[PDB]
Structure 1
Amino acid sequence: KGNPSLQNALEMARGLLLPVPAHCTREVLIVFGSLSTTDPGDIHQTIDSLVSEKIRVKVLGLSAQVAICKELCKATNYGDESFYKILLDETHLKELFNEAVTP
């Protein structure tokens, strides 16, 4: 139930990935099913902070291509726009989740 918030989830992800060491790559995987997000603050500042802390975000959306998720994936993956994945059917979700386990 409720109305999802990308910024709160990304802020707790940033907090959780603060104490991990620098040799360990910090990654965030988001299974975002909605099409709109409600944020308590500016999400572009959160994207800037995620880029500045070298956190890579890959988002597997469920319905369509949301702009903020695409911009977040493009910014946190050094310009690569291929980290925003939208599925087709039941088997493509297995394909995406099996692709996601590779480093």
Structure 2
Amino acid sequence: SIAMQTLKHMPGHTSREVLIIFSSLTTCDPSNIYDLIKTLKAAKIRVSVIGLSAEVRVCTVLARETGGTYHVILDESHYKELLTHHVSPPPASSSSEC
């Protein structure tokens, strides 16, 4: 929600992206996140979670529904590879506009 509040007023041309480095599998939230997923899809904010020591189901659906990618750390060397891969710009999909 904080990221959405800041990114809502961002220009349409730029690609709004979020990389959640998830460590604790639990997610205690005041409101259901499935509803927020709809707003994220409407706002075309790509969210690509990187989980740690857990294949979180809510984040799996988050990533695939919002268009981002989900991954889990095999080790520190693979963590380096994952973040270095995320460095590069992501391809623009149909929803993306220039």
TM range (shorter): 0.7 to 0.9
Task: Write the mapping of 1:1-103 to structure 2, written as runs, cut at 5 A.
Answer: 11-77=1-67, 83-103=69-89
> How well do the aligned residues superpose, as a CA RMSD in angstroms?
0.9
Cα separation, 2, equivalents of 1:12 and 1:45: 15
Give 1:36 deviation, angstroms. Answer: 1.1
Q: How many aligned positions are there?
A: 89
* Secondary structure of 2:5's aligned partner: helix
Cα separation, 2, equivalents of 1:72 and 1:34: 16
Percent identity of equivalent pairs: 46
Q: Which has the higher contact order (CA 8 A, sep 6+)?
A: 2
Which structure dedicates a bigger proportion of its chain to strand?
A: 1
Give 1:34 deviation, angstroms. Answer: 0.8
Give 1:25 deviation, angstroms. Answer: 0.8
User: Hey, what does 1:8 align to over in structure 2?
Assistant: none
Which residue identity is paired with 2:39? S
Q: Deviations over 1:38-93 (max 9, x none)?
A: 0100111111100010011000100111110001001100xx7xx00111111001
Query: What are structure 1's unaligned runs of at least 5 residues?
Result: 1-10
Segments of 4+ in structure 1 off by > 3 A? none
Query: What are structure 2's unaligned runs of at least 5 residues?
Result: 90-98
TM-score where L is the length of structure 2: 0.87
* Secondary structure of 1:23's aligned partner: coil
